[PDB]
Ligand binder design. Structure first.
Ligand SMILES: Nc1ccn(C[C@@H](CO)OCP(=O)(O)O)c(=O)n1
Ligand SMILES: [Cl-]
Lengths: 102, 112
């Protein structure tokens, strides 16, 4: 059960919030307000928005002290293990992430 | 300073190139972690996503659209994962920005 403070950032285009099931000491989520259901259904008109989401993710990673490194993840469909059909960019840090990435 | 990606870009190191335009290049990963594993890289030598800037917004969006379009062309219809690694903890080993696209198998959770 999350609190309003779990929203780390918001603007006209996107929301950033903590993952209530964190896979790392820091784990948050960047989503567009426009309900793109999955990255495979993004269209060319979404180019600037998609760019903005990545920029927001990295700015927030800095704000959350992920200077020693972090991982950005976007899941698509069943094989990507996408759990909600709204676009999510995962940002994970604060521990050594492994390889392969799942 | 120049990573091995500099050779892939100038074509001195042969690669299985899936797509190219003036802004980016797409090629198969030679150490694949999935049945399909390719990389989308900018031609602009951004070393890592933490060093991208506001004027790279459009380029970053373009990289994602190219990733998704190429995923389609590779038949990743049942799904796939996009990964960007930054720095040591992210397990970044090549310091030229690149998006991994992995598909053709079930991806697990957590993502590393
Ligand atoms: N068995 C392994 C071990 C390491 N790496 C390198 C990979 C993860 O460290 O590089 C991630 P990048 O810098 O985002 O390509 C690999 O490709 N295979
Ligand atoms: Cl997800």
């Amino acid at each position: 059960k999350s609190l309003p403070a779990d929203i780390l950032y918001e603007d006209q285009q996107c929301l950033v919030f903590r993952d209530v099931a964190p896979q790392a000491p820091v784990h948050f989520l960047v989503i567009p307000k426009k309900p793109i259901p999955r990255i495979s259904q993004a269209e060319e008109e979404d180019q600037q928005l998609l760019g903005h989401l990545l920029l927001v993710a990295k700015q927030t990673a800095k704000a959350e002290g992920l200077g020693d490194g972090y991982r950005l993840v976007i899941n698509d469909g069943k094989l990507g293990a996408q759990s909600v059909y709204h676009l999510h960019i995962h940002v994970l840090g604060g521990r050594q992430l492994q390889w392969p990435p799942g």
